[PDB]
């Protein structure tokens, strides 16, 4: 309910990554990655971020986690939580809270960097008169400039199809 909304969504993003990086059951991992992908889409849309951030949400949370949970469920289940997972989640939460505290009550945080501690509404553009939605025209390339690029991308996709059928018993 304040200005630091990109920071708050980044904090819940790191919350979700820890929440499935503590190695749970893989369907709970898929749930945690769904939460992380939703709030990361929120981050990239708050930088705006109109086209591409919701574009990938159709793929990343529209075409990937379905197959992930699919092959999760039909391969194995192992119906039983464990103390090591809860301990790793507590250590991840403690690392999160310690980084937040040393961003709040200090100036800079060094891993080997100098992060200026304030929610970045700045830097940001000074409202330039587009009238063409810059990133949409960006992705509206690949077709008048992307000669070699879409050729090798579609080529690798065709090879992906033939690789999948060969490994799953070509022909």
């Amino acid at each position: 309910m304040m200005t630091y909304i990109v920071f708050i969504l980044s904090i819940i993003f790191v919350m979700g990554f820890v929440g499935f990086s503590s190695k749970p059951s893989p369907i709970y991992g898929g749930l945690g990655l769904i939460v992380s992908g939703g709030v990361g889409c929120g981050i990239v849309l708050n930088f705006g971020g109109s086209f591409l951030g919701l574009m990938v949400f159709l793929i990343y949370l529209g075409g990937m986690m379905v197959v992930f949970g699919y092959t999760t469920a039909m391969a194995t289940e192992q119906y039983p939580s464990n103390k090591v997972v809860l301990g790793t989640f507590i250590t991840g939460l403690l690392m999160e809270f310690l980084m937040v505290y040393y961003v709040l009550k200090d100036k800079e945080v060094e891993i080997v960097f100098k992060f200026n501690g304030m929610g970045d509404w700045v830097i940001y553009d000074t409202g330039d008169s587009g009238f063409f939605s810059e990133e949409a025209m960006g992705i509206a390339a690949l077709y008048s400039y992307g000669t070699w690029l879409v050729i090798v991308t579609g080529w690798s996709l065709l090879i992906g199809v033939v690789v999948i059928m060969e490994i799953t018993r070509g022909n």
Binding site: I27, Y28, L31, I34, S50, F51, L54, M55, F57, L58, L61, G62, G63, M65, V66, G69, Y70, A73, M74, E77, Y79, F131, S133
Partner: protein
Amino acid sequence: MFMINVLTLIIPILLAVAFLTLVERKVLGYMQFRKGPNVVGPYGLLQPIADAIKLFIKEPLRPATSSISMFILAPILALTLALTMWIPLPMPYPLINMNLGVLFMLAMSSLAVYSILWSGWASNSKYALIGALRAVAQTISYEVTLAIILLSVLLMNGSFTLSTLIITQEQVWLIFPAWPLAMMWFISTLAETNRAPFDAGPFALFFMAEYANIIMMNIFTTTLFLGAFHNPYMPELYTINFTIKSLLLSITFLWIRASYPRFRYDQLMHLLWKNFLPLTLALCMWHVSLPILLSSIPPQT
């Protein structure tokens, strides 16, 4: 006043779902020779509201102390998708003027597939789970076809903005420059609503999610291919004719629900891939190669 706008969106949809249940049951009763039933309530309305409170108050025979988190997240996701996804649908002036909304519709359809998978996993390792896995497959194999067909019918809009869609649909409709593509899209909507010919609790809430998804796809149909001319300083005319076309297409959706047998799953996947998917490719490359033929590329503003 914006939360009041939210409430005036989400209060009529529950009444819309329950009265859709009475309308589908009585129009089955006046297609197939069962002239009724209408005794409970005058012309049958107190029977749907009592059916809603009956599914509310029903004794549980309670099996449901298994996996609390997944069992509380599957119906909540299905109902929040089905209840939030009339926001970019441009009933005359939409609730949020999203710059791109049809891709947002497709993303929420895939999240409904996630909720189906979560209920299938919460169905506790069963032949019902294998049937739910087949339902996931026959729901996921049509978001290819629906997205590619949607892409080619918005290629005559030029942009995703959907107010450019209501601009394009004033002179003629979008059924005439794409009638086979709209036919295949309508069959894809029959597949995505998971109903005939294409086939634990709270059953009332997954029921709610199904019917709100159907009325979403019908309003999205009526915006996408049909409609009337919008008039500023008179939105009520567009509301009237939009509601009439959506109601007629929902009754025709019932009229195809009644009179066809179900398909075997081999025939369903064979049908999808080996009949729709090359024909979608061919109609889509022809709708790509037509604006360079007719000097009519649509103005992305």
